[PDB]
Design a protein around this nucleic acid. Sequence first.
RNA 1: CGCGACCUCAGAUCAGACGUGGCGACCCGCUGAAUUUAAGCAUAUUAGUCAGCGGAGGAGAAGAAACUAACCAGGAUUCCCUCAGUAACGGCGAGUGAACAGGGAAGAGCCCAGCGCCGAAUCCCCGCCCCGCGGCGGGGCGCGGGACAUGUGGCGUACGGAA
RNA 2: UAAGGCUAAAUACCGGCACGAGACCGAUAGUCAACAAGUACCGUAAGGGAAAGUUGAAAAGAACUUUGAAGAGAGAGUUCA
RNA 3: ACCCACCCGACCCGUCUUGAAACACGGACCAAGGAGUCUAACACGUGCGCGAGUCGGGGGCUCGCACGAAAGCCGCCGUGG
RNA 4: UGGAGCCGCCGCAGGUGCAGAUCUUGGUGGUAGUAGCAAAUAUUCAAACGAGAACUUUGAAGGCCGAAGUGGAGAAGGGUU
RNA 5: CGACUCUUAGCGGUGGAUCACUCGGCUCGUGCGUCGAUGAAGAACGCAGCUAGCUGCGAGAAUUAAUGUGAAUUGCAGGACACAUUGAUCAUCGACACUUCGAACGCACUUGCGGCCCCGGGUUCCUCCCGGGGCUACGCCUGUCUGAGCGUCGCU
Lengths: 135, 50, 59, 51, 86, 122, 134, 158
Amino acid sequence: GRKRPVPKGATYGKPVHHGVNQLKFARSLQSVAEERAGRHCGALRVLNSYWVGEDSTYKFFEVILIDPFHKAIRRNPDTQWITKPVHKHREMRGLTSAGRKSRGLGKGHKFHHTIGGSRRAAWRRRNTLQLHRYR
Amino acid sequence: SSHKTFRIKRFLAKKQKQNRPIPQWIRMKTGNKIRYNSKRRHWRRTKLGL
Amino acid sequence: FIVDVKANKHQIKQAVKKLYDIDVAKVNTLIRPDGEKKAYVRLAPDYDALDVANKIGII
Amino acid sequence: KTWRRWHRRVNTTQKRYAICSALAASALPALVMSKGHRIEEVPELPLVVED
Amino acid sequence: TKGTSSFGKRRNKTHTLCRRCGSKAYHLQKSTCGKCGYPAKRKRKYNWSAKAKRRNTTGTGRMRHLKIVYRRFRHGFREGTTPKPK
Amino acid sequence: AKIKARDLRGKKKEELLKQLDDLKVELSQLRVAKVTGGAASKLSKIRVVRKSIARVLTVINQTQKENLRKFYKGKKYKPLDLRPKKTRAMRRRLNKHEESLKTKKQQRKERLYPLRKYAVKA
Amino acid sequence: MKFNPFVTSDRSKNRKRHFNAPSHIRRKIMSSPLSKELRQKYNVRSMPIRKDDEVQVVRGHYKGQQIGKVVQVYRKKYVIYIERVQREKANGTTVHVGIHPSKVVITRLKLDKDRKKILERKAKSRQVGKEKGK
Amino acid sequence: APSRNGMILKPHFHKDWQRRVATWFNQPARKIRRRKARQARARRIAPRPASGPLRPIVRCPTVRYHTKVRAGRGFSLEELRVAGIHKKVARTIGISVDPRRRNKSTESLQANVQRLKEYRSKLVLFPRKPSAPKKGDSSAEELKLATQLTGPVMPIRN
RNA sequence: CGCGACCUCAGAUCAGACGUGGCGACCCGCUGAAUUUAAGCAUAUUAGUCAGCGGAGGAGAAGAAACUAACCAGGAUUCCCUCAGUAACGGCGAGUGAACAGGGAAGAGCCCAGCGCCGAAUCCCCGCCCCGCGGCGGGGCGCGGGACAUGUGGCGUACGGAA
RNA sequence: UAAGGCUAAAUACCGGCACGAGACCGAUAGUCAACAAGUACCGUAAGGGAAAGUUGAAAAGAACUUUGAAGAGAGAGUUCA
RNA sequence: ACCCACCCGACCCGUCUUGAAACACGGACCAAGGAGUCUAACACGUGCGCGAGUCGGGGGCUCGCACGAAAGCCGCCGUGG
RNA sequence: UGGAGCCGCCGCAGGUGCAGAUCUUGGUGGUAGUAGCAAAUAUUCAAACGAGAACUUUGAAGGCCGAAGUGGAGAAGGGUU
RNA sequence: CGACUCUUAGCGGUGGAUCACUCGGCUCGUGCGUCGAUGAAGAACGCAGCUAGCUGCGAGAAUUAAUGUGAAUUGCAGGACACAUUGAUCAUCGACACUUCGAACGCACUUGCGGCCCCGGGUUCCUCCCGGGGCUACGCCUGUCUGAGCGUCGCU
Ligand SMILES: [Mg+2]
Ligand SMILES: [Mg+2]
Ligand SMILES: [Mg+2]
Ligand SMILES: [Mg+2]
Ligand SMILES: [Mg+2]
Ligand SMILES: [Mg+2]
Ligand SMILES: [Mg+2]
Ligand SMILES: [Mg+2]
Ligand SMILES: [Mg+2]
Ligand SMILES: [Mg+2]
Ligand SMILES: [Mg+2]
Ligand SMILES: [Mg+2]
Ligand SMILES: [Mg+2]
Ligand SMILES: [Mg+2]
Ligand SMILES: [Mg+2]
Ligand SMILES: [Mg+2]
Ligand SMILES: [Mg+2]
Ligand SMILES: [Mg+2]
Ligand SMILES: [Mg+2]
Ligand SMILES: [Mg+2]
Ligand SMILES: [Mg+2]
Ligand SMILES: [Mg+2]
Ligand SMILES: [Mg+2]
Ligand SMILES: [Mg+2]
Ligand SMILES: [Mg+2]
Ligand SMILES: [Mg+2]
Ligand SMILES: [Mg+2]
Ligand SMILES: [Mg+2]
Ligand SMILES: [Mg+2]
Ligand SMILES: [Mg+2]
Ligand SMILES: [Mg+2]
Ligand SMILES: [Mg+2]
Ligand SMILES: [Mg+2]
Ligand SMILES: [Mg+2]
Ligand SMILES: [Mg+2]
Ligand SMILES: [Mg+2]
Ligand SMILES: [Mg+2]
Ligand SMILES: [Mg+2]
Ligand SMILES: [Mg+2]
Ligand SMILES: [Zn+2]
């Protein structure tokens, strides 16, 4: 897990946020791997990853990255979508499969949050006052 | 300081060039609004961007 | 002279020399409190300094 | 603020009533003259012209 | 002696001119700025001081590439051609 | 008196260079004369000599650069100067051919099930 | 009215556009009309005035019939100076009084190839207007 | 404080609403824009119905709406199959197809079929070239109309 | 005690490529208070909000159901109206608080892996010729190199597909 | 029908380029900023941060005499003023 | 309405306060600026339109908007409240 | 006086009326020609220049700092002094 | 009457209210929706005949070329040009050019040290010396070369 990084305990404030130990990071470990791989290989572009093992203290992953300007990707139409500059850093924006999970979006009743694009948008649309021209 | 660095000396030497007053033939110019230089400096009072 | 502040003494001695069909003994820079590299340029005894001056335009 | 209530709205049925009133007192030369319109030598006050 | 007397011994300096951002704020012991973070790659900014932010955004300076891009774009980004000569 | 790009274009390279040096030289004569009072009439020239220099200079560089990209025209790997500078992103677009490559599959659909023009009510 | 939605009617925007207009645009602004003798001949209302077009002042103090040659146009100041339109200073030295092209009238143009062609353009586009109206 | 008789009321102005108020000074512009784009879609798809593609009759769900009838997303596969239309062609003659629609009741099935039967009839399929092959309709029904249908095609009256 | 395959792994100012910072109104991903309210205050609230970090594009994100429903049933996402200040949550206090259905804007659908068949039928790169060449592309021709069976390409993907 | 993936469109837009408009403000207002303003200046630094519009249609901006070392005036003059 | 004269009357306003001319606080002078707003939600009153209805939004149709980012219209006229 | 715009009526709209807020900004009085220009012994005579000299310069006299200096030289700092 | 004081008015000052202006804001709307190793944003230092600042530009430095425009610019100079000529000046902007820091890139931030290839003087490849030119960042991808290992095997 992720302990809360603060000097000694010392989460100054009300006694709720006082937790520093038993609390858990939003993205998953696979989605940390996919990020760190991407982050290191900034030219490359993360397609997806997979679990290969795990010790106590470690998990291990194999992230599948693509060179988006190697003709064999570029030229093949099925691939070339990755080249396009939107898909710059999918793993950073939360768009790998492992990334996507944490945003917490699907269809149907067990979601409702995320029912714009995403958790922020739903909340945005819900706390805009729409103040119409005529009221 | 008399142990200047080139960088400093250059920076000082721009400042001294910028200090000179306005040329009087400015003030006859057609759309003139500037009587005196204002941005002038005097080493004894006001002490540089250092 | 007033010289481009990027100059060495080597560059001035071979700049001068080219332009004025002249041979220098020793260049000797300083930088003015201004942005000007002023070179003092000793000419080798066989050439005069007053003569060349008139040649170039000053006096 | 921008979100002051600038626009206002009016029932359709009233708007129409209004426009009627208005068309009715486009006739009635007194009123038209009282509204200033210099209408002294005009011939017949719902003043209709060939097309 | 906390006060006036001691303003005496302001002989020597912390900061100097940064090389990236021109400010007199590059800390000589720390070898950084505190204005841009010089040696740190990414330009320091902070979304608390908006005022600071505005004092140097794109528009603030010469824009000597960025402006002439906007011209170029406008007309089309044309390259390697000329108008029809006389 | 006037130098005009017009004529320079055609002239031989060595000639142009001489003409430049001749100006450069004059420009030193002036700047000395600026120092020594000289005359007002001279301190116009100082501006004129500059652009006349810049003009020669430019035209030289132009000819030279034309002749470069006459040479490299056709060559696959050409220098970065002579490469086209649209905009960072706009040189990483897809390759005009590449973005209109279809998959064999997508063609097969374009053959078999094309959009028909149609109307309704008759 | 105007109707075109890329034009102004906007005190300030016009004024800036006038006062901060550049010289080649101020050529068009400092235009003046042609006297009725020319107007007949060239079939042109008006012409951007120039260094040595002879000219009658129409309004102001100097208002007269005295056909002066324009001396010089001061496009910075939107104003032309005219042969004899001048006033003594306190120290005796004469000074050209600035007159504004629109209160003047051209009585003899200074025709060159370019100006001739312009007047040929204006006639042409006039007569096309007349042919369209007919 | 409250003061003598009147709805206790909880109004939701506790978060920073003013940061996120949405004003509708757009709207008129947006009515215009959308409309322009609408008009331009029509002029693009010259004789095809502006409306878009033919859409099927469908009951609404739930004991409430139950009795009312709407337009569907598209015609289901049973309905094409029976009307005798290849599913990948239907998209190309202006026929909305969803495939996720189950078809339980025989009545609705035959209704939609009767639509598609009706539609194909009153359709004026142009040919590929001006040089006419089979299917593409006669030069009569082509000259007399390269004409659009403004409004949803075969409107769904309940 | 050599020479050779491959494997894993190094070094190169090796050949050609690409990422690096900025801007940040809007968007995505984390991170995340406390003033405040509750007439005190601790859960609650302020708020997943300010500040912090990351990454984008002309938009982003979303999206072609492990959906809603329970009906005579609808049929990707987004957006508006409505649902609804409702169901629900809450020291059931203060406060919070959606969703389907209905009407609208728009509307567009698809491809792999797999399972199988096709002499790898595929790809990248070098070199000569013709065209074209300021978004490096088309055709031809090389016992010229590599990638590829630890699986490329066509067919096909749940609306079923193959023979 | 999950644990692989692509997808225009309505939607967003206090930054940018460029336009239009306003029952808005009218130089203590309106942007900190109508002007050589993020300027001057302050602070080691982060940062803070102003003031400041208006002769006249035209410079015709007061030649010349006179008093005074001059600043200053007295006359004279320009100006519709 | 300017000054002056005399008779009578007459304490300095603002404020909190049971009580202020107070030995209660604010106020040297003058100019300009300066404080019950706007949105939402209810309530009652009142005016108008229609009436077992009413309703307009949101959308749509009518134009390049000069006035129009209006106005008009809609088996949407009623999904819906 | 000034020198370019303004008002009555009927309606609509509001950033609509100031003595105070130790209110904000600017300006001005009384105080007042007042408090003050008193730390470290010291000035004088002549001459010059000059419109003009208690203070400038030159000479003379009398004085002080009294080599841990009120002398000569540098560092830091200043930035043309 | 005297001086002073107070009051009122007239004229003077002080000060900048008022009113009238407005190349500025503020708001709403529309259309585009573009930065960067081909060196961005930003910074610095430079550049005018006389120029301090603002602006504009980059050692070709108040701008070169090209197109369009068709006689200026103008504070004063001084000049050009034949304005019956690619032609003043403006505008546009497609060609050319774009000093030093800066993601900033040979290593260092002193402007301090360097390496390797090519040229000119210097030699007569004699290395030195000077000057010039071109390379010398990190990470990563496809290929290439050179290699490593009691890694897995093959033949000798
Ligand atoms: Mg809490
Ligand atoms: Mg999981
Ligand atoms: Mg000091
Ligand atoms: Mg396939
Ligand atoms: Mg529709
Ligand atoms: Mg509390
Ligand atoms: Mg309280
Ligand atoms: Mg408390
Ligand atoms: Mg919460
Ligand atoms: Mg934040
Ligand atoms: Mg970025
Ligand atoms: Mg997307
Ligand atoms: Mg899926
Ligand atoms: Mg309700
Ligand atoms: Mg909440
Ligand atoms: Mg396969
Ligand atoms: Mg997606
Ligand atoms: Mg002001
Ligand atoms: Mg003011
Ligand atoms: Mg102001
Ligand atoms: Mg005023
Ligand atoms: Mg004026
Ligand atoms: Mg004034
Ligand atoms: Mg007057
Ligand atoms: Mg009491
Ligand atoms: Mg008492
Ligand atoms: Mg009190
Ligand atoms: Mg007091
Ligand atoms: Mg007031
Ligand atoms: Mg009522
Ligand atoms: Mg006036
Ligand atoms: Mg108002
Ligand atoms: Mg007051
Ligand atoms: Mg005294
Ligand atoms: Mg002693
Ligand atoms: Mg000394
Ligand atoms: Mg000493
Ligand atoms: Mg004033
Ligand atoms: Mg003022
Ligand atoms: Zn810095």
